[PDB]
């Protein structure tokens, strides 16, 4: 029992969690939802020799996201916490990695050009004046 | 002039060399991007 001690109850329960990487538009939509309570549905389909994982966007959030699994044995991960009460605790061992890809093949880059334009909106360029400024000195 | 100049004008310019050896491999073991990789033929290595 100390301030600097890390709780290890999560590792003793062998809790298994997943790591998901998503593109910026999905995270932006989830931030715009502002935690309403429902952002979408995740679908997991298992066949006789393959596993198919996909995510479905909410129809209210919009107004298919297939998931590709990745090898886990390359490196081991767990999840820890830092509280506002300064009590550190461990959640559990990461057991699976997930990668999110859009279903759009060529119509994705219509929005990607707009996103790059928004990113280059604060990119700053020099301006030309037709008449020289005579208010100096 | 010389008879070698006569031969180069009329029949064949001949094998062309750089620092003694033939044309080296500036690219990934090919003299020019037009020729196929891994070629030591006459046309691909500098012969006219």
């Amino acid at each position: 029992a100390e301030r600097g001690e890390l709780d290890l109850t999560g590792a003793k329960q062998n809790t298994g969690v997943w790591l998901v990487k998503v593109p910026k538009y999905l995270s932006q939509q989830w931030a715009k939802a502002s935690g309403r309570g429902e952002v979408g549905k995740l679908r997991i389909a298992k066949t006789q020799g393959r596993t198919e994982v996909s995510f479905t966007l909410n129809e209210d959030l919009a107004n298919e996201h297939p998931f590709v699994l990745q090898s886990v044995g390359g490196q081991t991960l767990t999840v820890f916490t830092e509280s506002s009460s300064d009590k550190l605790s461990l959640e559990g061992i990461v057991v699976q990695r997930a990668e999110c890809r859009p279903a759009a093949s060529e119509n994705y880059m219509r929005l990607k050009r707009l996103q790059i334009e928004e990113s280059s909106k604060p990119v700053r360029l020099s301006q030309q004046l037709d008449k020289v400024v005579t208010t100096n000195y | 002039g010389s008879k070698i100049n006569i031969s180069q004008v009329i029949a064949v310019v001949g094998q062309q060399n750089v620092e003694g050896k033939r044309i080296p491999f500036g690219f990934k073991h090919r003299t020019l991007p037009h020729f196929i990789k891994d070629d030591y033929g006459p046309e691909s290595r500098g012969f006219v």
Binding site: - | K28, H29, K37, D38
Partner: protein
């Protein structure tokens, strides 16, 4: 022929001979971690350098655009009468002009050298 590393401090292992049991004893001298090696080999050096280049060649070199493309000399595991031939072009590793055939099928990759 092969090396491994220490366990509890995760350091590089150095050899040691044993005075009592007369067995070679790989050990980390940043530790006291002692173990035997089943290989019983410490050092090998092929000075004439006849390594096997069949494991050296990447299986994806066949799908190169600017490599040659022959029609004869088919592959072994699959028929696929189309293949790529090239040389090693590795400096200081011999002087042979002998050709390295790779099958160009998308899921194959059995490479042979004749």
């Amino acid at each position: 022929v092969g090396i491994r590393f220490c366990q509890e401090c995760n350091n590089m292992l150095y050899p040691k001979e044993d005075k009592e049991n007369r067995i070679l004893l790989y050990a980390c001298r940043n530790c006291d971690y002692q173990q035997e090696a089943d290989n019983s080999c410490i050092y090998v050096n092929k000075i004439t350098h006849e390594v096997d280049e069949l494991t050296q060649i990447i299986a994806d070199v066949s799908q190169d655009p600017t490599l040659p493309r022959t029609e004869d000399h088919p592959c072994q595991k699959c028929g696929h009468k189309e293949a790529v031939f090239f040389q090693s072009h590795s400096a200081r590793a011999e002087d042979a002009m002998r050709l390295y055939y790779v099958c160009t099928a998308p899921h194959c990759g059995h490479r042979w050298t004749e």
